[PDB]
Design a binder for this molecule. Structure first.
Ligand SMILES: CCCCCCCCCCCCO[C@@H]1O[C@H](CO)[C@@H](O[C@H]2O[C@H](CO)[C@@H](O)[C@H](O)[C@H]2O)[C@H](O)[C@H]1O
Ligand SMILES: CCCCCCCCCCCCO[C@@H]1O[C@H](CO)[C@@H](O[C@H]2O[C@H](CO)[C@@H](O)[C@H](O)[C@H]2O)[C@H](O)[C@H]1O
Ligand SMILES: CCCCCCCCCCCCO[C@@H]1O[C@H](CO)[C@@H](O[C@H]2O[C@H](CO)[C@@H](O)[C@H](O)[C@H]2O)[C@H](O)[C@H]1O
Ligand SMILES: *CC(=O)N1CN(C(=O)C*)CN(C(=O)C*)C1
Lengths: 17, 552, 149
C-alpha cells in the first residue's frame, strides 16, 4: 500500500473513521 | 520590561502553586527575572531570581531562590533553628581571545531534600549530589594549563563524606614530528580535602611523558606507544584510618611505572553483490596489546579512581580506573571487529561491533576489593557489542550489550528504535538493563542490600508525538520497571499554538523518593499550565525526569 | 571470499590538502579533528593562505548533553546518558557547500559516594567523545566527494 505505513497512525487528511 | 503571563500549577507536594514573573530588561547584554511563587501547602512565597548576562568572558546565568519559612519543613524538622530554603545556581561558559577558557558550574542548596520538593528547572529529583566547579584555562595550539576547583554536596544521608580537589592544575604539552615520533607530556598537581575532619587529606603530583610511533597505510595502521607514569603522594591526617584499618597508609608514596601499548587496525572491503549492487561492506579488525607492570597500591587511599564501563569503545581504552589513585596492572590483548555497510552514495547505513579482552595475567592493584560472582582471573573475560542500523531516513535502531564472565551474567544492555518524521512527529521505544550482579560488583556495599537498588535496572520506555491540524501537539511518555512491575515516569502534554499566543498544559507522575518506614517508593503528580506570547513538541518532550533523546 | 584490502584512501584525493577553520581553534574538538586529519595524511593549511583552490572544513556548533537514561527504584538516577552533537561544513571551492554532522552516545552509572571520581570519569568520557566525533567527520568525507559528482 503506502510507502510509509506509519501514516495510518498520523496522516490527517480525511480520517475516514 | 514588565509583567509576564502568570502560569499555574497543582502538585501533591505543594498543592496550588502560583507564579507571577516580572521581566527587567537591564541592558542589551543583560536581563533579569523576578518571580514571586506562592505555595499553598507550604503557605508562603518563594522568590526566584533569574539573571542572564553576555560579556567578553562568555555567557552566564545566575539563579537565586529564597523561601523565608516552610511549614512542611518545620513540621518534619521541629528541632531546627529555621525553616528557610534556598538555591544558588551559576553557569558561566566562555572563551575570551580564543585562548582563555572560563567555566563555572555551581549549585548549592540549603537541604538535601530541596529538589524533591521544588521545581526541577536547574536541578532534578534524580540528582544524587550538587556540583560546584570552577575552571580557568589557557589553551594554545600546542599547550594548555587549567586551574580548577571541584566540590560536591552529597544529598544522601547514608554518607555525606565526599572528597574535593580544591586546587587542581592540568598542564598538557604536545610536540609532533620529533623525528618519526610524536611526543606528549601531561602534568597535574592536586590537593584532596574532605568534609569530615578525620578522613585522610592528600596532595598529589603526577607526571606523564609519552612517545608514540604511528605508521599509517591505505589498508592498515600500527601505532606503538611508550608511556611513563610518575606520581608522588603526600598524605596526612591518617591517625583515624590507620587506627581502625589493618592496612596502613603512608605519609609519602612514590609510584613510578612504565606502560607499553601496541594498537593495530586493518580495513577490508568487498562489493555487496547478493544485496543491491553498489553497496560496499567493510570489515575492520582491530587488535591491541597492553602491558602495565604491577605496583602495590594498598598504601594509597582511593580519592578519585572508579571503575570504567567497558563498551566496544571502552575495550580499547588503556585505563581500567579513572583518576590516578588506582592503576591496575595489565597484560592484555583486545580483539574487535567492526562491519560497516555503505550505499551507492557512500553513506554509512549499518555498523556492528563485537570485541573481547583476554587477560594473560590477573589485573591487580593491591587493593582488589571488588565482589565477583566467580573467581575468574585470566582468559577472555570482557565482551562488548554495538549496533546501529539506519533502516531508512525515518527509522533508526541502536543497541549495545556488555558481558562479563566474572559476573557470570550480562552486565549492561540497551536498545532503542525510533521513528522520526520530524520534530513534531516521532515515536520511540527503548530498553535499558543492568543486572543485580553488576550493581553488586560496581556500586557501594549497601546498594546490594537496599531494596531500591539491589534488583538492578530493567526499564522499558515509550515516547510518542502527534500533531493535529498544525495547531495542537500531543506528547506522551511512559517508563516501566519490569523487575518491580511498576511505573517510573509518565508524561502528557497538550499545546495549542496560535499566531500570538501558545497555551501549554502538562501532566507528570514520577518516582520522587523512598519511604523506609514502609519500604516503598513515593510518587508525585503535577498538572500545570502556562501561556506564552513551532508547536513546542521538543520542549514538552524534555520536561520529564527521563528526557527524550534523538536516535534518528 | 570476495574481500580485498582497501586500495583507496580514507580521505579523498581532492581533499588531501585542505583548510581547517573553526571559531574555537584551540578547543578540544579542533584538536581532535586536526589530529585525525593528520593520521590520514591530510595537509592542513592556514585559513589565511593565498592558496584558494583547496576545500575548507569549517567546524560549527558543538553540544554536549548529560541526562538520566534510567532511574533506580527510589527515583534516583542510575545511568547518565551523555550525547555529543557536532555540526560541520565542507566548502568545495567554486562548487558547493555540504553540511555534515557527527553524533556520539556514551553512558555511565552514577555514584554519589565517590562523586569526585565519577566527575573525573565524566571528563575522560568527554575526551573520548571528541575523538569519536573526529572519526565520524572524516568518515563522511567520501560521501561529500560522491555527492559532488
Ligand atoms: C515495535 C517493535 C517493532 C519495531 C519495528 C517496526 C518495523 C521497523 C521497520 C520499518 C521500516 C521498513 O518499512 C519500510 O521499509 C521500506 C522499504 O525500504 C522503506 O520505505 C521507503 O520506501 C521508499 C524508499 O524505498 C520511500 O519512497 C519511502 O518514503 C520510504 O518509506 C522504509 O524502511 C519503511 O517505510
Ligand atoms: C587487526 C590486526 C592487526 C593489523 C595491523 C597490521 C599492521 C599494520 C599495517 C600497516 C602498516 C603500515 O606500514 C607502512 O609501511 C610502509 C611501507 O613499508 C611505510 O612506508 C614508508 O616507510 C618505508 C620504510 O618503512 C619507506 O619505504 C618509505 O619511507 C615509505 O614507503 C609506511 O610508513 C607505513 O605506514
Ligand atoms: C553483537 C552486537 C550486539 C548489539 C546489541 C544486541 C543486544 C541489544 C540489546 C539487547 C537487549 C535485551 O537485553 C537483554 O535483556 C534481558 C531481559 O532481562 C536480560 O536478561 C536477564 O534477565 C532475564 C530475566 O529478567 C533473565 O532471564 C536472563 O537470564 C538475564 O540475562 C539480558 O541479559 C539482556 O541481554
Ligand atoms: C496511506 C494510505 O493508504 N491512506 C489511505 N487512507 C484511508 O484509508 C482513510 C487515506 N489516508 C489518510 O487519510 C491519512 C492515507
Amino acid at each position: 500500500a503506502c510507502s510509509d505505513f506509519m501514516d495510518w497512525f498520523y496522516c490527517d487528511g480525511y480520517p475516514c473513521a | 520590561s514588565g509583567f509576564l503571563i502568570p502560569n499555574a500549577k497543582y502538585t501533591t507536594t505543594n498543592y496550588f502553586e502560583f507564579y507571577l514573573p516580572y521581566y527587567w530588561n537591564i541592558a542589551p547584554n543583560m536581563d533579569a527575572t523576578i518571580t514571586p511563587h506562592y505555595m499553598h501547602r507550604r503557605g508562603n512565597i518563594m522568590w526566584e531570581n533569574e539573571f542572564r548576562y553576555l560579556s567578553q568572558a562568555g555567557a552566564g546565568l545566575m539563579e537565586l531562590d529564597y523561601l523565608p519559612s516552610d511549614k512542611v519543613y518545620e513540621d518534619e524538622h521541629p528541632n531546627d533553628d529555621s525553616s528557610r530554603r534556598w538555591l544558588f545556581y551559576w553557569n558561566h561558559s566562555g572563551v575570551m581571545d580564543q585562548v582563555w577558557r572560563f567555566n563555572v558550574d555551581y549549585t548549592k542548596v540549603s537541604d538535601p531534600s530541596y529538589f524533591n520538593d521544588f521545581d526541577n528547572k536547574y536541578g532534578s529529583s534524580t540528582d544524587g549530589y550538587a556540583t560546584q566547579k570552577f575552571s580557568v584555562g589557557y589553551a594554545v595550539q600546542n599547550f594548555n594549563a587549567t586551574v580548577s576547583t571541584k566540590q560536591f554536596q552529597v544529598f544522601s544521608e547514608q554518607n555525606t563524606s565526599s572528597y574535593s580537589a580544591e586546587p587542581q592544575l592540568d598542564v598538557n604539552y604536545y610536540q609532533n614530528d620529533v623525528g618519526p615520533f610524536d611526543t606528549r607530556i601531561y602534568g597535574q598537581a592536586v590537593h584532596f580535602v574532605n568534609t569530615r575532619d578525620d578522613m585522610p587529606e592528600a596532595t598529589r603530583v603526577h607526571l606523564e611523558p609519552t612517545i608514540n610511533l604511528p605508521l599509517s597505510n591505505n589498508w592498515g595502521s600500527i601505532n606503538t606507544e611508550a608511556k611513563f607514569l610518575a606520581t608522588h603522594y603526600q598524605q596526612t591526617n591518617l591517625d583515624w584510618y590507620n587506627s581502625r584499618n589493618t592496612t596502613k597508609l603512608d605519609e609519602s608514596v612514590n609510584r613510578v611505572m612504565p606502560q607499553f601499548k601496541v594498537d593495530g587496525k586493518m580495513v577490508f572491503e568487498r562489493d555487496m553483490e547478493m544485496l543491491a549492487p553498489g553497496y560496499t561492506q567493510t570489515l575492520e579488525p582491530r587488535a591491541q596489546y597492553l602491558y602495565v607492570p604491577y605496583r602495590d597500591q594498598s598504601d594509597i587511599y582511593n580519592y578519585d579512581s572508579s571503575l570504567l564501563q567497558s563498551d566496544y569503545s571502552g575495550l580499547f581504552r588503556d585505563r581500567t580506573y579513572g583518576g590516578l589513585d588506582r592503576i591496575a596492572s595489565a597484560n592484555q590483548v583486545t580483539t574487535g571487529v567492526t562491519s560497516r555497510i555503505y550505499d551507492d552514495a557512500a553513506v554509512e547505513r549499518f555498523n556492528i561491533s563485537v570485541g573481547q579482552i583476554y587477560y594473560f595475567t590477573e589485573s591487580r592493584t593491591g587493593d582488589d576489593n571488588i565482589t565477583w560472582e566467580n573467581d575468574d582471573k585470566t582468559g577472555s573475560l570482557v565482551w562488548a557489542g554495538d549496533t546501529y542500523w539506519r533502516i531508512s531516513e525515518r527509522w533508526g535502531l541502536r543497541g549495545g550489550i556488555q558481558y562479563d564472565t566474572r559476573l557470570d551474567n550480562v552486565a549492561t544492555s540497551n536498545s532503542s528504535i525510533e521513528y522520526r518524521r520530524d520534530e513534531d512527529r516521532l515515536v520511540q521505544l527503548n530498553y535499558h538493563y543492568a543486572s543485580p550482579e553488576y550493581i553488586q560488583a560496581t556500586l557501594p556495599k549497601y546498594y546490594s542490600t537496599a531494596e531500591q537498588y539491589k534488583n538492578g535496572i530493567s526499564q522499558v520506555g515509550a515516547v510518542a508525538s502527534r500533531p493535529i491540524a498544525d495547531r495542537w501537539s500531543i506528547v506522551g511518555a511512559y517508563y516501566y520497571d519490569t523487575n518491580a512491575n511498576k511505573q517510573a515516569d509518565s508524561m502528557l502534554g497538550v499545546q495549542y499554538s496560535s499566531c500570538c499566543y501558545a497555551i501549554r498544559v502538562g501532566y507528570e507522575r514520577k518516582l520522587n523518593g523512598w519511604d523506609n518506614d514502609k519500604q516503598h517508593a513515593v510518587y508525585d503528580n503535577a498538572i500545570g499550565f502556562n501561556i506564552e506570547l513551532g508547536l513546542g513538541t521538543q520542549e514538552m518532550l524534555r520536561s520529564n525526569i527521563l528526557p527524550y533523546q534523538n536516535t534518528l | 571470499c570476495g574481500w580485498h584490502l582497501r586500495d583507496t584512501t580514507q580521505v579523498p584525493s581532492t581533499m588531501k590538502v585542505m583548510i581547517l577553520d573553526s571559531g574555537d581553534p584551540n578547543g578540544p574538538l579542533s584538536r581532535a579533528v586536526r589530529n585525525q586529519l593528520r593520521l590520514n595524511g591530510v595537509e592542513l593549511l592556514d585559513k589565511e593562505t593565498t592558496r584558494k583552490d583547496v576545500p575548507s572544513l569549517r567546524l560549527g556548533k558543538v553540544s554536549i548533553a548529560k541526562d538520566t537514561a534510567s532511574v533506580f527504584r527510589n527515583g534516583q538516577t542510575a545511568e547518565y546518558q551523555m550525547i555529543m552533537t557536532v555540526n560541520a561544513t565542507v566548502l568545495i571551492p567554486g562548487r558547493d557547500i555540504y553540511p555534515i554532522s557527527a553524533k556520539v552516545f556514551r553512558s555511565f552509572f552514577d555514584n554519589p559516594q565517590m562523586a569526585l571520581a565519577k566527575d573525573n570519569e565524566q571528563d575522560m568520557i568527554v575526551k573520548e567523545m571528541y575523538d569519536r566525533a573526529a572519526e565520524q567527520l572524516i568518515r563522511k568525507l567520501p560521501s561529500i566527494r560522491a555527492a559532488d559528482i
